[PDB]
RNA sequence: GGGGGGAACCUGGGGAACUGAAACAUCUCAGUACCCAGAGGAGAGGAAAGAGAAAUCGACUCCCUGAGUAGCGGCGAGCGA
RNA sequence: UGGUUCGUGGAGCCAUGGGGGAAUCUGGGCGGACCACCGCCUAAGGCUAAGUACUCCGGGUGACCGAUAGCGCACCAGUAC
RNA sequence: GUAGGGAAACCGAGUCCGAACAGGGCGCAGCGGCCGCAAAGUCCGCGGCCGUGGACCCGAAACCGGGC
RNA sequence: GCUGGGGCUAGGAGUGAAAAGCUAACCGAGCCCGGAGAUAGCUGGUUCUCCCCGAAAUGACUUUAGGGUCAGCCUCAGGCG
RNA sequence: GUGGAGCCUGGGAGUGAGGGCGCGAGCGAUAACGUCCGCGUCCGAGCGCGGGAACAACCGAGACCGCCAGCUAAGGCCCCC
RNA sequence: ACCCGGUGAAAUUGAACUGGCCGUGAAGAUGCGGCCUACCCGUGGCAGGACGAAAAGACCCCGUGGAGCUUUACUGCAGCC
RNA sequence: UGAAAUACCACCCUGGCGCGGCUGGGGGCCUAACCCUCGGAUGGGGGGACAGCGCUUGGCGGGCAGUUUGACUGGGGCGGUCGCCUCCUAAAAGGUAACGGAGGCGCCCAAAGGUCCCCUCAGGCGGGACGGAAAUCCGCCGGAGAGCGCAAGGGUAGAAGGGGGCCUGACUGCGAGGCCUGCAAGCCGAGCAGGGGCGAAAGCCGGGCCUAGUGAACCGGUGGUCCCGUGUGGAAGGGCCAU
């Protein structure tokens, strides 16, 4: 409240899709985990394992991002960034896209 | 702006998109305005013609 | 009970990663025919709310 | 066999206003207060003409969470799965 | 018109005061206007423990009160007035 | 909490605007000898203040419901 | 005309040879209990001690003007130097 | 120039009725213990202390406590004193 | 009414050891200054003062307070077409 | 002789009726619903498919209901005022009040915009048919007292004034850095890219000598975009850009 005048907030304009009934469109969601967050794993990383380890959150598909250095692992992810694909490939890694 | 000095749009005569808003005095300038203006869609200078706002 | 998110702010405003508040520039909703391209163009960007108004808004968005 | 009673609780039939929106009418308060009918040791609900996206689940009730999310809103105050 | 988060909104769904008014599975309802496709379910009869609520009543226990406190009442109080 | 940017599709240490390899907005980043401390962050306690409730206490004139 | 006894009409309602009169000793809307701790940007009031610092009564906007929001001015913690 | 100076981040405010005086203007009547701004001051919050007979804001002066010690300030030094 | 025997209230009330003048003071002083005047305590009387008592001014203004009333204010509702 | 040859056939335009269909209106009568009535009631009389009543349409509607009915203000009312620009007050930086002293704005310009080229005023005196204080012409003087759309102020001919040619930068995408400032706004802006205008070129051009000519957000319209699209493809509806 601002003493009766139009407030700072109500004078800014709205922007963007706000949605409408019946609500949120159900669509697949992706969380990104970086190569740096994978160095603690030996062998084969999967969405199961990362969800356990407190990295990936439940109800999210797994996308590998490129911050960090790639370790020669068999990584099974729903999606990969371009940098994550180059780094992992050029390091003895096995990218396994899936659905 | 007024009743004799009206607001108007310039429509690119090639891709039919309105790129500019401007004004004229339709008593002094009854003819539709024709002005070469740069069209961002055609990415070239193009003839633009007055359409109604 | 728990705080409710002010939906007017949620629909106008974003809290950036470092905790600034960004909004759209006011003044290009209408009456634009005689505004230069510079005015239209610059009013099409986001800006950063002054600090006193940003703190008040962020309090209205407790679960962002 | 019914009638009438029972502190609260319950279901159904009706159903305000102050107040809040720093005025006010939509909105809020609230299907709350209260009136009435009925029930019982509980009452309601209940065995999909369901959910809703999972090629999935599998009556209903109740707690936690989902979530102040989705949305609803003089897109205001607020309301809210 | 009501119910739902849904205030007419693209407004479906559930309910129904008024008008019109079917079919019996190759029948019908739903998946948020509508249409196709693909699926889910079987309306217009009824019943159904438990887990849930409450505290007139009994008991147990308090980093509850201790006669201006604690129930309005420790006492012949819903009394005297 | 560990990723952000974008209305979004989406991309991602970037991203958005853009025709751009332009420019800009918003983002991105340990001390001492591998042991040790420390630190994101998060949990609980304590304290200040804020939001919702009567919300520091007492006070209207009034409005509404059901009765007398 | 006055008067006893027996009756009927009441709260946005009665009754009124009309005064907004009267409706149980205050009626421009009775009383009681309830919503209820209504709301009161107003007035009042706010309880032990010591120590350090220490304001303002301006600006902008405000159905604002004895009320607010931000800035100014006070204080505390951490940092800089 | 090391000061209860300054700058940065953050927690907590209060204030948003001022008033007197000096100087500078406006309004007023070269009126008001008038009114409205500007610079400054004091009272406000120093209604603690000395002087001005008495007396917030004029002169002197910023009260941590004690002393039956000394110097000064304004102002005083015939008596009240 | 007064005096004696019997019985014996009240509003009000910061405390009081409660004079006049001329000044001063928030602008009308028993309470400050200066001067004047004044032995202690009552009883019957009078009302000039204690800005005497009573009643949180009815006038007046202010509150985005209330209520009654009006209309070609707004928006509804009964009713009527 | 036709713009249009004539017979018959045909599809049709403007009409006119005859039949058939669905429709909708009025009028007359009937009785049996419904309503009223009748000492007699499965009946008689009257009204009559109207009226009443149900759902729905629009209308009149202080009879009643909820409310609104601004602020500033040398008390309130009445009057005046309310945003923006210019000058003064304003105490030679900026800022600075009163219901202090004076004015103006709510537009306008398709050139009154860009660039290149060229030109220089007002006024005074003298000369000149109609012709005047002032029309147009000539000479001399004349630094700006003219002009710059409109208030005022600043500025200005070493042009911002007057004339002409070609033009549309009255750009698209950005924007270092600042002015101002409580916020939000407002203002100035070099430079880079795209594609242009003018110029031989240097260069200039993102409207106008400058400061008034204005309105946050919500709600909705239109043109694009093709971003979302409630099982899926579409669509409905949104988003974004422009207005
Ligand atoms: C003026 O006469 C006033 C009237 C009071 S009652 C109308 N008197 C005192 O205020
Ligand atoms: Mg306003
Ligand atoms: Mg959303
Ligand atoms: Mg334009
Ligand atoms: Mg024009
Ligand atoms: Mg584009
Ligand atoms: Mg036109
Ligand atoms: Mg709640
Ligand atoms: Mg909103
Ligand atoms: Mg946003
Ligand atoms: Mg727009
Ligand atoms: Mg316009
Ligand atoms: Mg312009
Ligand atoms: Mg422009
Ligand atoms: Mg601009
Ligand atoms: Mg753009
Ligand atoms: Mg917060
Ligand atoms: Mg918060
Ligand atoms: Mg959350
Ligand atoms: Mg009974
Ligand atoms: Mg019973
Ligand atoms: Mg109940
Ligand atoms: Mg019910
Ligand atoms: Mg009920
Ligand atoms: Mg009712
Ligand atoms: Mg209400
Ligand atoms: Mg109300
Ligand atoms: Mg409330
Ligand atoms: Mg209110
Ligand atoms: Mg209020
Ligand atoms: Mg009100
Ligand atoms: Mg209300
Ligand atoms: Mg409501
Ligand atoms: Mg309530
Ligand atoms: Mg409700
Ligand atoms: Mg049980
Ligand atoms: Mg049961
Ligand atoms: Mg069955
Ligand atoms: Mg279920
Ligand atoms: Mg199955
Ligand atoms: Mg089954
Ligand atoms: Mg969650
Ligand atoms: Mg609400
Ligand atoms: Mg809601
Ligand atoms: Mg609702
Ligand atoms: Mg509700
Ligand atoms: Mg529900
Ligand atoms: Mg509905
Ligand atoms: Mg509902
Ligand atoms: Mg509804
Ligand atoms: Mg609906
Ligand atoms: Mg359907
Ligand atoms: Mg149905
Ligand atoms: Mg029905
Ligand atoms: Mg079937
Ligand atoms: Mg079928
Ligand atoms: Mg159905
Ligand atoms: Mg379904
Ligand atoms: Mg569907
Ligand atoms: Mg189903
Ligand atoms: Mg079944
Ligand atoms: Mg059923
Ligand atoms: Mg049962
Ligand atoms: Mg049960
Ligand atoms: Mg309990
Ligand atoms: Mg017990
Ligand atoms: Mg016991
Ligand atoms: Mg005890
Ligand atoms: Mg006792
Ligand atoms: Mg007791
Ligand atoms: Mg005792
Ligand atoms: Mg006690
Ligand atoms: Mg008891
Ligand atoms: Mg008691
Ligand atoms: Mg007892
Ligand atoms: Mg007794
Ligand atoms: Mg986002
Ligand atoms: Mg793009
Ligand atoms: Mg870039
Ligand atoms: Mg970048
Ligand atoms: Mg950067
Ligand atoms: Mg910690
Ligand atoms: Mg706080
Ligand atoms: Mg409460
Ligand atoms: Mg209270
Ligand atoms: Mg509190
Ligand atoms: Mg009311
Ligand atoms: Mg009322
Ligand atoms: Mg009643
Ligand atoms: Mg009675
Ligand atoms: Mg009688
Ligand atoms: Mg009689
Ligand atoms: Mg009698
Ligand atoms: Mg009687
Ligand atoms: Mg009667
Ligand atoms: Mg009666
Ligand atoms: Mg009443
Ligand atoms: Mg009543
Ligand atoms: Mg009446
Ligand atoms: Mg009489
Ligand atoms: Mg009584
Ligand atoms: Mg009584
Ligand atoms: Mg009486
Ligand atoms: Mg009376
Ligand atoms: Mg009276
Ligand atoms: Mg009343
Ligand atoms: Mg009433
Ligand atoms: Mg009353
Ligand atoms: Mg009475
Ligand atoms: Mg009584
Ligand atoms: Mg009661
Ligand atoms: Mg009750
Ligand atoms: Mg209540
Ligand atoms: Mg309360
Ligand atoms: Mg109260
Ligand atoms: Mg009120
Ligand atoms: Mg108040
Ligand atoms: Mg009090
Ligand atoms: Mg007090
Ligand atoms: Mg200190
Ligand atoms: Mg100090
Ligand atoms: Mg003031
Ligand atoms: Mg100040
Ligand atoms: Mg002020
Ligand atoms: Mg006011
Ligand atoms: Mg006032
Ligand atoms: Mg006022
Ligand atoms: Mg006061
Ligand atoms: Mg006030
Ligand atoms: Mg403040
Ligand atoms: Mg400071
Ligand atoms: Mg601070
Ligand atoms: Mg420090
Ligand atoms: Mg220091
Ligand atoms: Mg200091
Ligand atoms: Mg300091
Ligand atoms: Mg300081
Ligand atoms: Mg600071
Ligand atoms: Mg700070
Ligand atoms: Mg504090
Ligand atoms: Mg505190
Ligand atoms: Mg204050
Ligand atoms: Mg104020
Ligand atoms: Mg002052
Ligand atoms: Mg001062
Ligand atoms: Mg003043
Ligand atoms: Mg003064
Ligand atoms: Mg004085
Ligand atoms: Mg003076
Ligand atoms: Mg002097
Ligand atoms: Mg002046
Ligand atoms: Mg004189
Ligand atoms: Mg004065
Ligand atoms: Mg004076
Ligand atoms: Mg004076
Ligand atoms: Mg002063
Ligand atoms: Mg004070
Ligand atoms: Mg002093
Ligand atoms: Mg003093
Ligand atoms: Mg003093
Ligand atoms: Mg004082
Ligand atoms: Mg004194
Ligand atoms: Mg003294
Ligand atoms: Mg003194
Ligand atoms: Mg003295
Ligand atoms: Mg003196
Ligand atoms: Mg003095
Ligand atoms: Mg002094
Ligand atoms: Mg001196
Ligand atoms: Mg000291
Ligand atoms: Mg000292
Ligand atoms: Mg000496
Ligand atoms: Mg001396
Ligand atoms: Mg002397
Ligand atoms: Mg002497
Ligand atoms: Mg003496
Ligand atoms: Mg003496
Ligand atoms: Mg002596
Ligand atoms: Mg005697
Ligand atoms: Mg005696
Ligand atoms: Mg006696
Ligand atoms: Mg007494
Ligand atoms: Mg005393
Ligand atoms: Mg004494
Ligand atoms: Mg004496
Ligand atoms: Mg005495
Ligand atoms: Mg005496
Ligand atoms: Mg005086
Ligand atoms: Mg005196
Ligand atoms: Mg005396
Ligand atoms: Mg004394
Ligand atoms: Mg004295
Ligand atoms: Mg004395
Ligand atoms: Mg004396
Ligand atoms: Mg004396
Ligand atoms: Mg004397
Ligand atoms: Mg006597
Ligand atoms: Mg006497
Ligand atoms: Mg006497
Ligand atoms: Mg007397
Ligand atoms: Mg007497
Ligand atoms: Mg007297
Ligand atoms: Mg008095
Ligand atoms: Mg008197
Ligand atoms: Mg008195
Ligand atoms: Mg008194
Ligand atoms: Mg009172
Ligand atoms: Mg009073
Ligand atoms: Mg009174
Ligand atoms: Mg009166
Ligand atoms: Mg009055
Ligand atoms: Mg007054
Ligand atoms: Mg009043
Ligand atoms: Mg007010
Ligand atoms: Mg009022
Ligand atoms: Mg009323
Ligand atoms: Mg009333
Ligand atoms: Mg009604
Ligand atoms: Mg007939
Ligand atoms: Mg007939
Ligand atoms: Mg017949
Ligand atoms: Mg018949
Ligand atoms: Mg007949
Ligand atoms: Mg008959
Ligand atoms: Mg008959
Ligand atoms: Mg008949
Ligand atoms: Mg009919
Ligand atoms: Mg109809
Ligand atoms: Mg109607
Ligand atoms: Mg009316
Ligand atoms: Mg009325
Ligand atoms: Mg009527
Ligand atoms: Mg009435
Ligand atoms: Mg109004
Ligand atoms: Mg109003
Ligand atoms: Mg006023
Ligand atoms: Mg005033
Ligand atoms: Mg006046
Ligand atoms: Mg004045
Ligand atoms: Mg006066
Ligand atoms: Mg006055
Ligand atoms: Mg007037
Ligand atoms: Mg204003
Ligand atoms: Mg304006
Ligand atoms: Mg100046
Ligand atoms: Mg000046
Ligand atoms: Mg400045
Ligand atoms: Mg002032
Ligand atoms: Mg002037
Ligand atoms: Mg203007
Ligand atoms: Mg042109
Ligand atoms: Mg000449
Ligand atoms: Mg001549
Ligand atoms: Mg001549
Ligand atoms: Mg000039
Ligand atoms: Mg002119
Ligand atoms: Mg003019
Ligand atoms: Mg030309
Ligand atoms: Mg030219
Ligand atoms: Mg050309
Ligand atoms: Mg162009
Ligand atoms: Mg900048
Ligand atoms: Mg700014
Ligand atoms: Mg401007
Ligand atoms: Mg270029
Ligand atoms: Mg070029
Ligand atoms: Mg060229
Ligand atoms: Mg060139
Ligand atoms: Mg440029
Ligand atoms: Mg230009
Ligand atoms: Mg020009
Ligand atoms: Mg707007
Ligand atoms: Mg709105
Ligand atoms: Mg919109
Ligand atoms: Mg479109
Ligand atoms: Mg698509
Ligand atoms: Mg779909
Ligand atoms: Mg298809
Ligand atoms: Mg698709
Ligand atoms: Mg759209
Ligand atoms: Mg679209
Ligand atoms: Zn084009």
């Amino acid at each position: 409240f601002e003493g009766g005048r139009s407030t700072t907030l109500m004078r800014l304009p709205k922007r963007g899709m706000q949605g409408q009934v019946p609500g949120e469109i159900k669509r697949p969601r992706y969380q990104g985990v970086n190569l740096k967050d994978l160095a603690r794993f030996e062998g084969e990383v999967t969405p199961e394992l990362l969800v356990r380890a407190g990295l990936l959150k439940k109800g999210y598909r797994l996308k590998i991002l490129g911050e960090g250095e790639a370790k020669p692992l068999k990584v099974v992810a729903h999606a990969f960034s371009k940098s994550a694909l180059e780094k992992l490939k050029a390091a003895g890694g096995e990218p396994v896209l899936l659905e | 702006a007024s009743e004799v000095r009206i607001k108007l749009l310039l429509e690119c005569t090639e891709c039919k998109r309105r790129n500019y808003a401007t004004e004229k005095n339709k008593r002094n300038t009854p003819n539709k305005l024709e002005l070469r203006k740069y069209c961002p869609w055609c990415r070239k200078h193009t003839v633009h013609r007055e359409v109604k706002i | 009970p728990k705080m409710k998110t002010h939906k007017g702010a949620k629909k106008r405003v974003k809290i950036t990663a470092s905790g600034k508040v960004v909004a759209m520039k006011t003044g290009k909703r209408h009456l634009n025919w005689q505004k230069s391209g510079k005015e239209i163009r610059q009013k099409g960007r986001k800006f950063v709310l002054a600090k006193p108004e940003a703190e008040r808004i962020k309090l209205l968005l407790p679960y962002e």
Side-chain angles (χ1 to χ4, degrees), chain A residues 1-88 90-99, chain B, chain C:
Chain A
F1 190 72
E2 287 179 18
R5 67 184 187 214
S6 37
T7 72
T8 305
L9 182 56
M10 292 308 157
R11 296 164 84 267
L12 307 171
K14 292 173 68 184
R15 148 169 280 249
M17 281 171 289
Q18 306 307 350
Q20 55 283 323
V21 297
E24 187 165 64
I25 287 98
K26 191 161 196 313
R27 67 171 43 88
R29 302 170 296 185
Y30 295 86
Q31 177 187 324
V33 190
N34 292 282
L35 309 171
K36 44 186 277 313
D37 296 357
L38 298 180
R40 70 156 72 64
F41 295 104
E42 301 299 329
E44 187 195 46
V45 355
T46 71
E48 155 182 69
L49 185 60
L50 312 182
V51 105
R52 240 153 55 194
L55 299 171
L56 172 64
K57 297 219 212 242
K58 304 198 179 199
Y60 279 78
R61 280 164 191 197
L62 164 64
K63 187 175 177 185
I64 304 290
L65 301 177
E67 185 90 313
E69 267 105 281
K71 244 177 58 175
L73 290 149
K74 186 206 179 175
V75 290
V76 175
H78 294 84
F80 294 78
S81 49
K82 303 181 279 288
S83 28
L85 264 187
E86 302 190 19
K87 295 193 189 187
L88 172 81
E94 189 183 339
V96 178
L97 112 136
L98 85 142
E99 181 130 28
Chain B
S2 63
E3 182 256 63
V4 54
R5 169 155 294 272
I6 63 126
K7 314 164 196 190
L8 62 108
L9 309 189
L10 295 184
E11 182 194 8
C12 168
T13 202
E14 289 189 31
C15 72
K16 296 279 292 173
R17 298 195 182 86
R18 292 82 138 84
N19 288 325
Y20 298 94
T22 200
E23 59 178 75
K24 79 169 179 183
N25 182 297
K26 68 170 181 172
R27 171 246 320 166
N28 315 334
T29 304
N31 289 334
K32 302 304 176 191
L33 294 189
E34 309 200 27
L35 293 183
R36 285 182 72 258
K37 315 279 303 178
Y38 181 84
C39 175
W41 309 89
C42 300
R43 272 169 60 66
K44 69 197 265 229
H45 271 76
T46 229
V47 183
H48 284 68
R49 189 167 304 265
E50 164 182 342
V51 291
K52 186 158 136 295
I53 206 151
Chain C
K2 52 188 172 173
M3 303 217 288
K4 300 189 161 173
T5 304
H6 187 272
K7 296 322 179 87
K10 174 71 186 297
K11 294 173 185 174
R12 290 167 166 91
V13 139
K14 191 187 191 182
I15 304 166
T16 72
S18 72
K20 307 179 181 111
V21 177
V22 291
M24 298 300 308
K25 305 291 302 182
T26 58
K28 52 178 289 248
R29 280 299 200 237
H30 65 158
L31 301 163
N32 290 359
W33 94 94
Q34 66 180 0
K35 303 174 170 160
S36 56
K38 162 190 180 190
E39 173 177 0
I40 291 301
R41 203 177 303 113
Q42 291 174 354
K43 288 191 172 180
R45 294 192 25 239
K46 302 181 166 181
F47 75 116
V48 176
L49 273 165
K51 200 163 61 175
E53 308 303 325
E55 300 167 340
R56 304 171 70 215
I57 299 199
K58 271 194 290 162
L59 293 184
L60 302 162
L61 303 170
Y63 318 92
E64 288 306 288

